[PDB]
Every structure is written in C-alpha cells, then in structure tokens.
Write an enzyme that holds these catalytic residues in place. Structure first.
Site, mmCIF file in Angstrom:
data_model
loop_
_atom_site.group_PDB
_atom_site.id
_atom_site.type_symbol
_atom_site.label_atom_id
_atom_site.label_comp_id
_atom_site.label_asym_id
_atom_site.label_seq_id
_atom_site.Cartn_x
_atom_site.Cartn_y
_atom_site.Cartn_z
ATOM 1 C CB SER A 120 14.698 10.140 -8.038
ATOM 2 O OG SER A 120 13.377 9.915 -7.341
ATOM 3 C CE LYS A 161 12.391 6.583 -9.920
ATOM 4 N NZ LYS A 161 13.440 7.707 -10.077
#
Ligand SMILES: [Mg+2]
Length: 203
Positions: A120, A161
C-alpha cells in the site's frame, strides 16, 4: 481489523525517543496499520514520513531492515519488502510521523514493531521518486501500483487509514471508496501534488 482506541493508547504509550527534525529536502506521507497477536480483530493506523537519506539509527532496531527498489535503484529503511519498480538511486528512511509542525519541522518517534509490510506504500514511493522534487505534500497516499506503473490499485484497511490521516488534519488520497480524494493514476496524483490540495471551485 477494526479501529481500537484502546489498542492505540496502549501501543503508542510504548513509543519512545520522539525527535523534532528539520524539514526534509522532500518527502511523502503514507499510512500504516498496527496489530498485535493478542488483540485479534483490533487495529489502529498511524503515519510514516519517508525522507531522503539512510538513518537506520533513527528507527527502533526492529525496523532496521533495508528493502530495495527494482534493479538496485535505491533503498528504503524501515520497509520490509522490496519495491517492484525503480527508485531514483537514493536511499530513504521511513519514519513514524508523530507530528508535522507549522514551521515545517517533523516530529518523529521510535515504535516497537516490525517494518512496514505490504503493497500500500507504493503510490507514495512512486510519487516520491518520480513526481516530488521539493517538500512534503500535505496529504496521505495509499494504494498499490499496477504493472504499467501508472494505474493505482485498491488496498486494504482504508477506513483505518482515513482515520489516521484525519488525526493529523490531512486528507487520505487513493483510488477507492473510503478515500477523501480520488486519483485513478499517478498523473492525477502528481497534478494533485502541484496543486497542494484538491483544486477548488469556490465559485
Ligand atoms: Mg538512475
């Protein structure tokens, strides 16, 4: 996992040796998801900032692991997997970002954990070696990078996130539902960096 403020406070209480540093030449901010064995189903996010230079001595020894960009084209400390595209021949360090002060200074700290794993971080790193020249974009990037090295690919843990981005008053940037600002490829991501933020229509 799913967000745990209980997990957050416990793990973070264990962070040590916070440091205010000068603004890096350039840099890029990305999110990470913390878990522990004995807290199944719990997670919390925090931020890394990735800066030019090799400073393994700024990391907790358990993060002092060196990964490389494709074809010996640079390295990142604090990241646990190699990068599947080229870097810009530089070595970076990914540091736990406690705070980004108003004068530009960054406050980092040491974190009792392993290095950042998984795909990511790619959007950030790709933008850092290709598209960022001066400064640290005041936004948080998450996403895998596709084999064409332009198409951004959905990732896991986007809610966590987002929350970690928001704690710092920063937007989450990616390619998927959950992100505050949407970019499908590195071009748009790059145009976003130039703009400093999503262009506005205050009309
Ligand atoms: Mg070169």
């Amino acid at each position: 996992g799913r967000f745990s403020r209980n997990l957050k406070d416990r793990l973070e209480s264990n962070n040590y040796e916070e440091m205010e540093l000068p603004p890096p030449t350039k840099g890029v901010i990305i999110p990470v998801v913390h878990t522990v064995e004995s807290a199944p189903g719990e997670a919390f996010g925090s931020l890394l900032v990735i800066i030019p230079g090799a400073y393994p001595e700024l990391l907790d020894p358990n993060q002092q692991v060196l990964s490389h960009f494709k074809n010996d084209t640079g390295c990142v400390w604090g990241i646990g997997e190699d990068i599947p595209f080229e870097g810009d021949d530089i070595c970076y360090t990914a540091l736990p970002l406690k705070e980004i002060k108003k004068d530009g200074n960054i406050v980092v700290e040491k974190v009792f954990a392993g290095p950042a794993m998984g795909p990511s971080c790619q959007l950030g790193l790709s933008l850092l070696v290709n598209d960022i020249d001066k400064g640290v974009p005041r936004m948080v990037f998450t996403g895998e990078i596709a084999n064409d090295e332009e198409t951004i690919v959905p990732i896991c843990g986007v809610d966590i996130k987002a929350i970690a981005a928001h704690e710092h008053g920063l937007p989450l940037v990616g390619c998927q539902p959950g992100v505050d600002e949407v970019v499908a490829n590195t071009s748009l991501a790059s145009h976003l960096i130039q703009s400093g933020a999503l262009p506005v229509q205050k009309a």
